Amino acid sequence: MRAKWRKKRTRRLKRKRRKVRARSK
Amino acid sequence: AVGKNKRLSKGKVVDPFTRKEWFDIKAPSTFENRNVGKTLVNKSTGLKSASDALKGRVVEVCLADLQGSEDHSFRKIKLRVDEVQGKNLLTNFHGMDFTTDKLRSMVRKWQTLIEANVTVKTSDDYVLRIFAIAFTRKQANQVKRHSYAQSSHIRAIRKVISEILTKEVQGSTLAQLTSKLIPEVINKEIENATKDIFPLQNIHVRKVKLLKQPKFDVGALMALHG
Amino acid sequence: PKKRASNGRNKKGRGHVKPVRCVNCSKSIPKDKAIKRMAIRNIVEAAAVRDLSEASVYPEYALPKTYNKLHYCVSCAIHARIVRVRSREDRKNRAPP
Amino acid sequence: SQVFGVARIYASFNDTFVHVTDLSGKETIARVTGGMKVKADRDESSPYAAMLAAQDVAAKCKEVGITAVHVKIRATGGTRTKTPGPGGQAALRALARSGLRIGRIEDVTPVPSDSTRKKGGRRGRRL
Amino acid sequence: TPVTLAKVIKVLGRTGSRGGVTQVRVEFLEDTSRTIVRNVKGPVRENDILVLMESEREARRLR
RNA sequence: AUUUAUUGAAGACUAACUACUGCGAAAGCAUUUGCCAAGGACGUUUUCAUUAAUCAAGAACGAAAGUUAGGGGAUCGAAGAUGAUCAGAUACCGUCGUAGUCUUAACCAUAAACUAUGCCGACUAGGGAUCGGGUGGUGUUUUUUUAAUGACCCACUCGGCACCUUACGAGAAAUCAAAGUCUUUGGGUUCUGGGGGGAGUAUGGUCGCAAGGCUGAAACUUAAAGGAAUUGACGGAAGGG
RNA sequence: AAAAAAAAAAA
RNA sequence: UCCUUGUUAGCUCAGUUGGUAGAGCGUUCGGCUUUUAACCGAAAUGUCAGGGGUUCGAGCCCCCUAUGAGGAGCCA
RNA sequence: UCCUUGUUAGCUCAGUUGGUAGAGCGUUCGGCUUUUAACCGAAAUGUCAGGGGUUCGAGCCCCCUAUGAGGAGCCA
């Protein structure tokens, strides 16, 4: 697939992980 | 498309060219011709007073169709209606302008274009926008193919043009000015004023647009129309 | 790899060109890469010009013309049967016919 | 000797308006269109339809008494194509064959000084 | 029910995806000196004659 | 209704001139006019006298989108709503259209931010054209025949954007007047890379209102990924038959 | 300038 | 109950007392594209809402009912 | 328990007592294509939940059974 989309996907994932770790902390 | 319409009307014949009538139109005296045409309104009823609906009009016609010659063939003129007396209604100058084809033909590439504009009043309290134009021309013996300018020459040329038009207008009233335009002497003045700077072909001036009128002065309009 | 020393266009020393719009598909493209042509044409046609001059007052008038500069993009041009494609060597050639 | 009007042709893709007026343009006559002469919604702009419109406006001008016309041809202009549709020249030829007299043809297509913005987006009307 | 005659003077070539159509220029018999371009369906020659139910129309030039 | 004519308001844009043309460190910059301060090149028998080159750390500017707050809000228009198309189509096409597009005051600090070619310097083949400046010429033209200027022509030169031809040279080649002067290997200097993936991911830092940026691995996995060109085949790519 | 999706791998 | 409006082919709509009435759709066939058509040519289509009456002639003009829509109002 | 509503082609669903009842998808057949899809032509299919009755005639009308779903189950 396209790097633009892999990057977008990854950014959304980083965001989600950030907020759930915020729940923990 | 013919029978495609769903509803002609939201809520759910009289021939008027029998109700209409024609009108001869008179240009001013700064013109070789006067009888420009014919114009349509409804019968001046007791409520409408067709003279006014006829009065607030403007018409475009060519300077060649005014002076006979095909030299002033592009050169439209906008004439305003201001007065009526029995089916020979008068007109006054409302504006001049060029034709698309002529302006475009003037505009070629590999020759620098110059444009100016002034927004000046007159002796008789009119206000006008006189647009000027010019194009660099390739001298004879010239080889280099484009003949562009150096932009200080352009600033200076535009200064010259502006002060020239101001000097002429302030002193030329409106019709004195129109008869200054028709023979195209301003072009001669401009090329003589700028030849010591740069060649400058194609200096046919450009449109001129009334921005503000003074009061009516039926006296002057009558002095025009004989 | 590199197909063109000009790379598509006529930009060597600017950076930016304030583009324009291809008329057939309203598409943005720079003015240095655009295809520019110019269409100057008699208004009517060499066929009906005779009917015009016959039914015309003001004899020998002018037959004026209409002038418009046309910016097409690459795709619309090649679809409209213009600069279509050339081999390598004649791709380097730059002058018209 | 001559009674002159103003032809006001607007030739666009998808249509062709042919309508005529007095020299001032306020009192108007004989506005008719390709869709008023045919029923397709695709041949609105077609030369046959424009020609029929021209024949009809010629009939109407002759029934009024008008004999000649100065011509103002126009395309959409503004931000759109600026080039006339196919029907303009056909309408012109049609009325000139119909019998009216002709003058002062001019392209009056409204043109901007670098207008606002054109529709379709920077990537185009993709198809 | 008026018609018009014309003389085929100059045959140009074929048109159509399937090439069963011709483009020709023809001279009006009456009101001559008028030369108009038209389509044809079938076989045709020079010097020929055509019968138009309508005269004031020409087909797309393909050249 | 559309269309025509005459007007006014709004806000954006600055056409055609506009080009193998200009400026600016880059991003970028186009109506006119004026004010402010700056800058290059050229000219110089002016002055200073080695003050210089490139540079970590550290600083300024930094397209678009985006964010905050005010104004504005005409077009076009992510989202969204809709009409089609299609097996489906919340995609392509069409009609509407909030945000945004615009501006002030702040942030963000990225980009195919590309010439995908770091900067300074020297030398090496030809040819012509062009932009700015300068020089010479009983050269041409304009004025007041004349002068002086100005614009054009010829020659020359400095500095620019570039360009055409060849390859002596170089290179994997494409191609290149630098990507040459490097196995006959060294002019000075900063940055960067070490098979491909995982991964510009995780973690920890720090900057930021946020979005995110900058820095930045490991496990594990793999024998090929890849570059330039050749001959074919194929094309809802063109041309001819 | 409507439409026109897919074809196990191995050599 | 008062006034107005409509009852029409399978759906929806137009109609002058000189017509068992005209429209697009639906579908019967035929063109038409290689065809999928968008498309074009000919048919059938409406006890013209129901029943009375006037008229040389009523979807049509007069009376009534039923039906649907809108607004007005309502002493058993 | 009560009140209200439903039961129809394999699935989802339509109906004015007057046809061993109708759609779409599915299934099957032929074609197009190298092949499958899509596409084009065609077909066949139901004991209308069961049981009584009214009628000349019941998917419809009324009544019980089964099943389904919605609601009610309150004040202390």
UniProtKB/Swiss-Prot annotation, chain B:
The gene is RPS1A. The keyword Chaperone does not apply. The keyword Ribonucleoprotein applies. SMART domains: Ribosomal_S3Ae. The modification N-acetylalanine is found at residue 1. One of its GO terms (cellular component) is cytosolic small ribosomal subunit. Keywords: Acetylation, Cytoplasm, Isopeptide bond, Phosphoprotein, Ribonucleoprotein, Ribosomal protein, Ubl conjugation. Belongs to the eukaryotic ribosomal protein eS1 family. GO terms for biological process: translation. PROSITE patterns: RIBOSOMAL_S3AE. It comes from Saccharomyces cerevisiae (strain RM11-1a) (Baker's yeast). This is Small ribosomal subunit protein eS1A. Residues 1-12 have a biased composition (Basic residues). GO terms for molecular function: structural constituent of ribosome.
UniProtKB/Swiss-Prot annotation, chain C:
One of its GO terms (biological process) is ribosome assembly. Its main location: cytoplasm. GO terms for molecular function: mRNA binding; structural constituent of ribosome. Keywords: Cytoplasm, Ribonucleoprotein, Ribosomal protein. One of its GO terms (cellular component) is cytosol. It is found in: Cytoplasm. Component of the small ribosomal subunit (SSU). Mature yeast ribosomes consist of a small (40S) and a large (60S) subunit. The 40S small subunit contains 1 molecule of ribosomal RNA (18S rRNA) and 33 different proteins (encoded by 57 genes). The large 60S subunit contains 3 rRNA molecules (25S, 5.8S and 5S rRNA) and 46 different proteins (encoded by 81 genes). eS26 interacts with eS1 forming part of the mRNA exit tunnel. eS26 interacts with TSR2. Component of the ribosome, a large ribonucleoprotein complex responsible for the synthesis of proteins in the cell. The small ribosomal subunit (SSU) binds messenger RNAs (mRNAs) and translates the encoded message by selecting cognate aminoacyl-transfer RNA (tRNA) molecules. The large subunit (LSU) contains the ribosomal catalytic site termed the peptidyl transferase center (PTC), which catalyzes the formation of peptide bonds, thereby polymerizing the amino acids delivered by tRNAs into a polypeptide chain. Present with 503000 molecules/cell in log phase SD medium. Belongs to the eukaryotic ribosomal protein eS26 family.
Swiss-Prot record, chain D:
GO terms for biological process: cytoplasmic translation; maturation of SSU-rRNA; maturation of SSU-rRNA from tricistronic rRNA transcript (SSU-rRNA, 5.8S rRNA, LSU-rRNA); ribosomal small subunit assembly; translation. Belongs to the universal ribosomal protein uS11 family. Present with 3370 molecules/cell in log phase SD medium. There are 2 genes for uS11 in yeast. One of its GO terms (molecular function) is RNA binding. It holds the Pfam family Ribosomal_S11. NCBIfam families: PRK09607.1. Gene3D superfamilies: Ribosomal protein S11 (3.30.420.80). It is found in: Cytoplasm; Nucleus, Nucleolus. One of its GO terms (cellular component) is cytosol. PROSITE patterns: RIBOSOMAL_S11. Residues 118-127 have a biased composition (Basic residues). Its main location: cytoplasm. Residues 107-127 are annotated as: Disordered. This is Small ribosomal subunit protein uS11B.
UniProtKB/Swiss-Prot annotation, chain E:
Keywords: Acetylation, Cytoplasm, Ribonucleoprotein, Ribosomal protein. PROSITE patterns: RIBOSOMAL_S28E. N-terminally acetylated by acetyltransferase NatB. It holds the Pfam family Ribosomal_S28e. InterPro entries: NA-bd_OB-fold, Ribosomal_eS28, Ribosomal_eS28_CS. Coiled coil: none annotated. It is found in: Cytoplasm. One of its GO terms (cellular component) is cytosolic small ribosomal subunit. It comes from the Eukaryota. GO terms for biological process: maturation of SSU-rRNA; positive regulation of nuclear-transcribed mRNA catabolic process, deadenylation-dependent decay; ribosomal small subunit assembly; ribosomal subunit export from nucleus; translation. GO terms for molecular function: structural constituent of ribosome. CDD domains: S1_S28E (cd04457). Component of the small ribosomal subunit (SSU). Mature yeast ribosomes consist of a small (40S) and a large (60S) subunit. The 40S small subunit contains 1 molecule of ribosomal RNA (18S rRNA) and 33 different proteins (encoded by 57 genes). The large 60S subunit contains 3 rRNA molecules (25S, 5.8S and 5S rRNA) and 46 different proteins (encoded by 81 genes). Belongs to the eukaryotic ribosomal protein eS28 family. PANTHER family: 40S RIBOSOMAL PROTEIN S28, SMALL RIBOSOMAL SUBUNIT PROTEIN ES28. Present with 94500 molecules/cell in log phase SD medium. This is Small ribosomal subunit protein eS28A.
